[PDB]
Design a binder for these strands. Structure first.
Ligand code: K
Ligand code: K
Ligand code: K
Ligand code: K
Ligand code: K
Ligand code: K
Ligand code: K
Ligand code: K
Ligand code: K
Ligand code: K
Ligand code: K
Ligand code: K
Ligand code: K
Ligand code: K
Ligand code: K
Ligand code: K
Ligand code: K
Ligand code: K
Ligand code: K
Ligand code: K
Ligand code: K
Ligand code: K
Ligand code: K
Ligand code: K
Ligand code: K
Ligand code: K
Ligand code: K
Ligand code: K
Ligand code: K
Ligand code: K
Ligand code: K
Ligand code: K
Ligand code: K
Ligand code: K
Ligand code: K
Ligand code: K
Ligand code: K
Ligand code: K
Ligand code: K
Ligand code: K
Ligand code: K
Ligand code: K
Ligand code: K
Ligand code: K
Ligand code: K
Ligand code: K
Ligand code: K
Ligand code: K
Ligand code: K
Ligand code: K
Ligand code: K
Ligand code: K
Ligand code: K
Ligand code: K
Ligand code: K
Ligand code: K
Ligand code: K
Ligand code: K
Ligand code: K
Ligand code: K
Ligand code: K
Ligand code: K
Ligand code: K
Ligand code: K
Ligand code: K
Ligand code: K
Ligand code: K
Ligand code: K
Ligand code: K
Ligand code: K
Ligand code: K
Ligand code: K
Ligand code: K
Ligand code: K
Ligand code: K
Ligand code: K
Ligand code: K
Ligand code: MG
Ligand code: MG
Ligand code: MG
Ligand code: MG
Ligand code: MG
Ligand code: MG
Ligand code: MG
Ligand code: MG
Ligand code: MG
Ligand code: MG
Ligand code: MG
Ligand code: MG
Ligand code: MG
Ligand code: MG
Ligand code: MG
Ligand code: MG
Ligand code: MG
Ligand code: MG
Ligand code: MG
Ligand code: MG
Ligand code: MG
Ligand code: MG
Ligand code: MG
Ligand code: MG
Ligand code: MG
Ligand code: MG
Ligand code: MG
Ligand code: MG
Ligand code: MG
Ligand code: MG
Ligand code: MG
Ligand code: MG
Ligand code: MG
Ligand code: MG
Ligand code: MG
Ligand code: MG
Ligand code: MG
Ligand code: MG
Ligand code: MG
Ligand code: MG
Ligand code: MG
Ligand code: MG
Ligand code: MG
Ligand code: MG
Ligand code: MG
Ligand code: MG
Ligand code: MG
Ligand code: MG
Ligand code: MG
Ligand code: MG
Ligand code: MG
Ligand code: MG
Ligand code: MG
Ligand code: MG
Ligand code: MG
Ligand code: MG
Ligand code: MG
Ligand code: MG
Ligand code: MG
Ligand code: MG
Length: 245
RNA sequence: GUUCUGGUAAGCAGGACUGGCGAAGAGGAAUGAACCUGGCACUGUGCUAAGGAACCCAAUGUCUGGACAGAGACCGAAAGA
RNA sequence: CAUCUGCUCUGAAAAUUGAUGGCGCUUACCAGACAUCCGAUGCACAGUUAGCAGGUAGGAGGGCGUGUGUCUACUGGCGAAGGUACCGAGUGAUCGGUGGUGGAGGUAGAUGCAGAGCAGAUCUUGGUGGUAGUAGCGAUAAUUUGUCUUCAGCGGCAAAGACUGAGGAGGAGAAGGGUUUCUUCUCAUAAGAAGAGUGAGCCGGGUCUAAGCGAGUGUGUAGAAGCAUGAGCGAAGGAGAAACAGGUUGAUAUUCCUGUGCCUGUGCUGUCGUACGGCAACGUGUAUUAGCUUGUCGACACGAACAUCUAGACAAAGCAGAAACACCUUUUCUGUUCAAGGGGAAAAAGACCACUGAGACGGAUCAUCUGGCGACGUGGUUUUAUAUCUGUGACCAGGCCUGAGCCUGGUUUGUUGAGGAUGGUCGUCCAUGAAAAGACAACUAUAUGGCAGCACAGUCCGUACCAACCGUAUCAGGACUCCAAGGUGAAGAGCCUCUAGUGGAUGUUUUACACAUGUAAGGGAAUUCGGCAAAAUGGAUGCGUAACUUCGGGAGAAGUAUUGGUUCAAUUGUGAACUCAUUGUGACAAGGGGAAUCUGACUGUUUAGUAAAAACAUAGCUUCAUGAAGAGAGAUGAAGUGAGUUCUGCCCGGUGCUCGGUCGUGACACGGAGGAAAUGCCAGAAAGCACGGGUUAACGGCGGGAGUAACUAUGACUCUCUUAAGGUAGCCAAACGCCUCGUCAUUUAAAUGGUGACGCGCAUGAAUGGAAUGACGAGAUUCCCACUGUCCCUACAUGUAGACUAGCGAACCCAUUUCCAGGGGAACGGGCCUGGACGGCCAGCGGGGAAAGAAGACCCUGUUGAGCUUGACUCUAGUGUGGCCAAGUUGUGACGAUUGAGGCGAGCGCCAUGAUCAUCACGACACACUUGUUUAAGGACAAAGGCCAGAUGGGGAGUUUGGCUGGGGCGGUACGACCACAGAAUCAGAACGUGGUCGACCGAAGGUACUCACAGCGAGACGAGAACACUCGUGUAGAGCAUAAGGACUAAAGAGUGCCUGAGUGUGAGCACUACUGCUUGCAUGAGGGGAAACCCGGGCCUAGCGAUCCUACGCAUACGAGACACUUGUGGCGUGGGUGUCAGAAAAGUUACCACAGGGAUAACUGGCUUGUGGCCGCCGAGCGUAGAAAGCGACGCGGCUUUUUGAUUCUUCGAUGUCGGCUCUUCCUAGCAUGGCCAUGCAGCCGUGGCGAAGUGUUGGAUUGUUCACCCACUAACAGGGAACGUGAGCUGGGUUUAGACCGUCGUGAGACAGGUUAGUUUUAUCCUACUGUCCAAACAGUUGAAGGGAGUGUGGAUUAGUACGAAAGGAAACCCACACGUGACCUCUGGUGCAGCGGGUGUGCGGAAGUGCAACUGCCAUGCUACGU
RNA sequence: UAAGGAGCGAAGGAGGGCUAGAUUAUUGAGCAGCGAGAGGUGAAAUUUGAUGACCUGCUUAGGAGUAACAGAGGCGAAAG
């Protein structure tokens, strides 16, 4: 047969375009700074708003981008790095923040610029500090617990734009605007409605799959469709998670 | 043509024996691949075959019995007056 | 009288008109005989001749002709070759001469070399016919008259008549074209030839940057591709310094000329400058370069309402000129202009500054709103149009003259108003709506800078025209944009007009059949698969509006009434009166409505060119995988179901996916033992596999049999088999039910239909999603109201073609000689045989030419393909897993490998610890390697490369998927062997002919020598019987012989008993159609067997139990071995084993309804032919039955025929094509007689019937369900018989069924896919030829006639009278003449319907100044003549 | 007013909402010790354990609850 939809959309001419982008998002590199928030802006592909910051490096003014936490305003002064106060919207070394606190834009290793929590409405929880090893345990929004060194930086607050998934998209055109900038195929034609030249689920005198939909992790790429390496299937209840800090 | 097997049968399917048409014209059965007479270079005079002999159409008449049905010369059964 | 033989007779019915061959024959027949004649390529005689002589496929011998070579002989201007008429020679292929034409070359003989002879190939190229002066050439607005040319153009010009109608058939640009544009001449004309024509600082290109492309460099490659970075490039419609009027040419113009300007720079001469004002909001002053830095401009979505301006359009008055006047009118028409640049208001809308000090309150918008972070008020500051003036006069209208110049006007007011411009507000979004070049301000330094005059400069390329573009063209198609008047009306709708633009194949009143349209008595879907098509409804205003519903909707529900003109009131609500001959959204424009069911939630999308859908999408719901990112779990990808409401039961046995451990297996490397060494051997061994768990909103799956309740039925209850679990809740003859047209109710006169119920449901059912509704479908289906030419049943009229005529002018197709009936024939003839008939012409028509299209698409065959699937065969990319490979450095412990000095148990193995090399975790440093944490972080790990080895692998690649066969498939095996039967008494001998057997078994069931029988039957012998052991007599096999069938065997070949391993070893010859195989037989040998010996034995009493080349295993002796020699491996020879059952021997699964190619009537799906089982119809006999009684009527059990209208059986004709079911329409034939006419019998009183005979003239209907033929009901009737003609009839129609490609359901399949199972959507071409048929002319002067031959026509019902009569116990109950009607036939318009071309009238919208006369769009009342039936 | 509402003074109660903490217990994982049974009942079987259960240590992760004191005691319109 021919090449399936899933492979074609991974070729280079289909990658997302950057022409409307504001810049690369991430923290400054300097040990200490005082910054001012210049503007709060929407960026074409992203639902969380961005804040433009201004800080001096040598004598010269320089500009950066952060993801906005909820409760900043244009004109606010913010303090970055060691010796910053625990005030909403400051950036601090993680070892300085008390247990049970909520944080965003956490660095996985020092000076990486911030990864981890970046989507609207999300946060992470500080669950443990180890005074020997200088590690800290953070609980991520998937439920995963990960350990990071005390020298990493983090932003104090919750990411702006929460609640967005409460309102249903009642019409086809509303879905159109949401997926127009994403990589997923919309509208999505079902594999059982294709001919066998186009998809492993195609063909036959009734619309059916005909073979089990759970497939191996090591299966060849042009036929790896369906539920890939599923441990279980169906709507029944699972089992207890195992937890360590 | 003579015989045989399967089949209700068939211008049906399949064997055996002796001549044909295929690869065979000519005269005769009104017409017909295979039936009757009889096997072909080219001319001329006579004679016969098979089949014909009121007329179409070259050659026809005679004797003795049957037969009356728009019958027969071409043409079907068991049963009958 | 009884039998037998001959001829006649009865049994004896088929579809166009018919066949002893015809006409005829009764003395042309049947049977028995007789005469002699006619008749072959045969026979006789005679010529010619080698004479011995037919011939496909095929084979051989001898000759004729063509282009060129070598030689010999000749020839041509006193006319060569060629070509054309005649004449001679040869059986023939061919050859020779004569007379005209032609104008320079040509042969005869013998040999040599070959591109060496045409009727055909749907042959190749070129040229020409018939058809044929024919088919056609005419969609759109429309044309007439005069006059000149033209020389014969509806060409030009005047006057009329029309049309596009400002979302134009008008005026311009772009893409595309490229001289098509202008002048002259000529026909050569959508034709040529010769010239001429496009002028810029201010218009556009050359500039900037979007999405993006990229030279070079780095890395890579055999060279490439690719990847990282990046000079340069990227928009004639995005950003982008500065121009406008009026004139002029045959053709250019914001480009030329005149006038008035502007931008960017340069230089001269004058003339001034080095600062101030306001509480403030800010002003006055035309101001230099340069630089940091901060900001602004360039610089931006959609939608709605409200202001203001400008084009435009109206109406009054003034003047100037036009139109109209039988009448009337100060009625009607055209005009009344002002650019860029300069100067400049009031106004409206917002910002802001000073004083002031406000509320349970003031201000303010069409709408939101607004104020102590300062309201109202009073005075100011600033930003954004426009009117008006100047632009020095141009331009327009009119008058007077004129081959030129003068003169006069261009004045005032009101209403409205963009489809253009601008301003400040408001709404929407999980969508927030480009960059850069180039500018400007503030701040800091620095200063000869501003203005006026005059002068200079600004390169290069494009510039004509389009009705001329793309479609083979002068093609009804396609193709990016701009400007836009008046009336009617909501409206750049339709209809009518102003500005501007427009047109030719000719004449004829022109039948039939058409194509676009009108109208119709009475009836109203009776029509048809089906209301398909048409009709009906229609705008605005008011009254009045149901079920159900997600509460939004349904809803314009439905149902009803009103509407013109005039003259008034009243001011947006509307009222009232008067008036008209059909009435008023008058033309144009403009919904039919209701009740239910199946199905998809909705708007949206799709097979360009047969499918618009129930299919796809969609919002919502659920599952899965991941912490990797230029992205970071409200994320990023993969699947399934299909909005909302309400539910979503049970199963982890199989298959898959996933998790955990090894107990076993499982590669290469790395080790070990041995040997002179190679080859082998042993250990070792990840992941996988196996094993144990999880998982169905994963693939999917979800039962049988017996009994049992006070009538019968049914079974809550019991028992029994069975499993992974035995279909829960719901729903149903449903788009899913075979039987099936299921049963009951309702709808109709009548229901293979619809709806409601019921349910052991062939084969319903839960995100392979189940069930009940709303709103919305060019979706499928049933019914009702309105409405109608769909129909009964057709008639009349209009336009355009068509017929005839002038001008112009083709194609398909074609072996062609073409009237029928029967016969035969390749089984349906135009041509052949025997009969019936025989002409040409013009216009129509569709019976035939199995008419033309196109090497049948269905079906089979080919050792021909391609797309797609998987549990087919053999490989492969990707993904995982192991060991090894760039000398990192140094610590600690550990297991392991190798050998000593210790200890235990009757020097052994076992237990202690001490030295020698690898080596697995763990630490701590920095040097390889990694990362924009980069003057940095990690770190010998990772990540990325390389060489070998295992695992997985329809993600892909190649290929295969036997044969015979009363077509193929499914089934069997007639595919290798053996016996019997038949195949007309040797042997042989076919069919999916008949009865069967084989793929082995046995140390004896083999070899030998000797002994004796057997199966039974008749007597006996205790328990002891039908049947126990023992005896005597008979006993030709009635028994046995392992295993089919046949043959064979008696002191044995059978049953016993003894001994043996001949079921030896070498090597020959033969038989069975004889290779393999099986058997028969010769000679030589054994320290061979059995027997006294003669004799016998190298398997089974005889006929069946089996297999090549190459490779490999074993036995046997004799060989070979590379320069030489020794050994371990190897190679030769003979013979046996390991195996091919498709058995004279490839290594192999499906599907195509998406389909291709070569062929086949060697072979299926129609018709026809032969047959007639089965279907249908008729005879013979007489057992019984009929109230008696064989036979009025019947007729068992048996027996003989006919028919082709049923279905089989067979494969003769057609696969380079004979259009396939039913209906509609129309004609003819058959009889086996339903009605109607004449008769005979009766169990015939009469009435009504029943059985038969001669007879085919005239009849045999309207409907409901269904695609039906068929069936079954209702209504009528004299009666509602049965059939044929290529299952009559598609260049006659229709297209409901079946049977291409889309899609749903059930059952089957792991799947792609299947299903004489159900459902819905699905392109019907061409006559102009010949012949037939129908009419028309000629053959046939004119007037009056004749009648050969051909055609043919009237059929039936009722009433009255006989008569309440005959006849019958009664009840009942018949038989001419006359009159009324229906169907059919032929005519006719006096009457009555219908139609409206000629004729008279009326109104609506808009044109010609009014009235009168009238155009266009079309509407409407009456109606001559004519034609017609619903009339006579 | 030994009718009602407003208010003052000292005090009492498991009455209610919110914020920040707590001693144990029941399960689950990690690691260590030991080496055969644990559980459950009237009596037993399903079941789990040499992949080391049970019991005893140390670590951790969660989500409920407030024993004994505690009563013919208190509070609230009732539910509590
Ligand atoms: K997308
Ligand atoms: K499909
Ligand atoms: K499928
Ligand atoms: K499905
Ligand atoms: K299945
Ligand atoms: K032949
Ligand atoms: K012969
Ligand atoms: K003859
Ligand atoms: K024959
Ligand atoms: K004669
Ligand atoms: K005759
Ligand atoms: K005779
Ligand atoms: K030829
Ligand atoms: K030939
Ligand atoms: K018009
Ligand atoms: K733009
Ligand atoms: K000039
Ligand atoms: K516009
Ligand atoms: K130009
Ligand atoms: K108008
Ligand atoms: K109007
Ligand atoms: K207009
Ligand atoms: K209009
Ligand atoms: K109907
Ligand atoms: K029907
Ligand atoms: K139709
Ligand atoms: K309600
Ligand atoms: K309705
Ligand atoms: K009306
Ligand atoms: K109309
Ligand atoms: K739909
Ligand atoms: K719509
Ligand atoms: K549609
Ligand atoms: K699913
Ligand atoms: K979905
Ligand atoms: K549902
Ligand atoms: K299972
Ligand atoms: K399973
Ligand atoms: K049930
Ligand atoms: K059913
Ligand atoms: K029925
Ligand atoms: K019914
Ligand atoms: K089922
Ligand atoms: K099911
Ligand atoms: K389920
Ligand atoms: K539709
Ligand atoms: K006419
Ligand atoms: K004409
Ligand atoms: K015949
Ligand atoms: K025949
Ligand atoms: K014939
Ligand atoms: K013919
Ligand atoms: K015709
Ligand atoms: K015809
Ligand atoms: K380090
Ligand atoms: K370093
Ligand atoms: K460091
Ligand atoms: K394949
Ligand atoms: K056969
Ligand atoms: K035997
Ligand atoms: K050697
Ligand atoms: K050598
Ligand atoms: K072998
Ligand atoms: K074979
Ligand atoms: K398909
Ligand atoms: K047939
Ligand atoms: K055919
Ligand atoms: K058809
Ligand atoms: K009769
Ligand atoms: K008749
Ligand atoms: K047709
Ligand atoms: K005369
Ligand atoms: K006559
Ligand atoms: K009349
Ligand atoms: K009339
Ligand atoms: K007009
Ligand atoms: K409290
Ligand atoms: Mg596939
Ligand atoms: Mg489905
Ligand atoms: Mg002959
Ligand atoms: Mg003679
Ligand atoms: Mg020959
Ligand atoms: Mg040659
Ligand atoms: Mg000459
Ligand atoms: Mg040749
Ligand atoms: Mg004509
Ligand atoms: Mg018109
Ligand atoms: Mg118009
Ligand atoms: Mg138009
Ligand atoms: Mg021209
Ligand atoms: Mg310009
Ligand atoms: Mg450029
Ligand atoms: Mg531009
Ligand atoms: Mg011009
Ligand atoms: Mg200008
Ligand atoms: Mg031009
Ligand atoms: Mg009518
Ligand atoms: Mg009427
Ligand atoms: Mg009908
Ligand atoms: Mg219709
Ligand atoms: Mg229903
Ligand atoms: Mg739609
Ligand atoms: Mg189509
Ligand atoms: Mg269509
Ligand atoms: Mg769907
Ligand atoms: Mg749903
Ligand atoms: Mg619910
Ligand atoms: Mg049904
Ligand atoms: Mg019907
Ligand atoms: Mg029903
Ligand atoms: Mg189903
Ligand atoms: Mg004939
Ligand atoms: Mg063919
Ligand atoms: Mg073909
Ligand atoms: Mg073959
Ligand atoms: Mg192939
Ligand atoms: Mg291919
Ligand atoms: Mg396989
Ligand atoms: Mg075959
Ligand atoms: Mg024996
Ligand atoms: Mg022997
Ligand atoms: Mg063979
Ligand atoms: Mg045949
Ligand atoms: Mg028969
Ligand atoms: Mg027939
Ligand atoms: Mg044809
Ligand atoms: Mg043919
Ligand atoms: Mg035909
Ligand atoms: Mg008769
Ligand atoms: Mg037919
Ligand atoms: Mg026909
Ligand atoms: Mg159809
Ligand atoms: Mg189909
Ligand atoms: Mg359709
Ligand atoms: Mg008229
Ligand atoms: Mg333990
Ligand atoms: Mg307590």
């Amino acid at each position: 047969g021919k090449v399936i939809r899933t492979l074609r959309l991974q070729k280079e001419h289909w990658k997302r375009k950057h022409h409307k982008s504001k810049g690369i998002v991430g923290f400054p590199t300097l040990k200490n700074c005082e910054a001012t928030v210049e503007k709060i802006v929407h960026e074409s592909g992203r639902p969380a708003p961005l804040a433009i910051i201004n800080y001096k490096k040598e004598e010269k003014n320089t500009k950066g981008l952060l993801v906005a936490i909820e409760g900043i305003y244009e004109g606010q002064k913010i303090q970055i790095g060691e010796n910053a106060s625990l005030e909403l919207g400051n950036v601090c070394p993680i070892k300085e923040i008390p247990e049970g606190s909520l944080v965003s834009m956490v660095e996985k290793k020092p000076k990486d610029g911030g990864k981890y929590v970046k989507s609207p409405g999300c946060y992470a929880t500080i669950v443990y500090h180890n005074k020997l090893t200088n590690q800290t345990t953070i609980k991520l929004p998937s439920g995963e617990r990960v350990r990071v060194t005390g020298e990493s930086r983090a932003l104090l607050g919750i990411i702006a734009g929460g609640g967005k998934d409460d309102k249903p998209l009642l019409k086809a055109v509303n879905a159109y605007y949401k997926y127009k900038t994403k990589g997923k195929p919309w509208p999505r034609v079902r594999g059982v409605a294709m001919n066998p030249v186009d998809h492993p689920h195609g063909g036959g005198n009734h619309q059916h799959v005909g073979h089990p939909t759970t497939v191996s992790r090591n299966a060849p790429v042009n036929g790896r469709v369906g539920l890939v390496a599923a441990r279980r299937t169906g709507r029944k209840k699972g089992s207890r998670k195992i937890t360590v800090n």
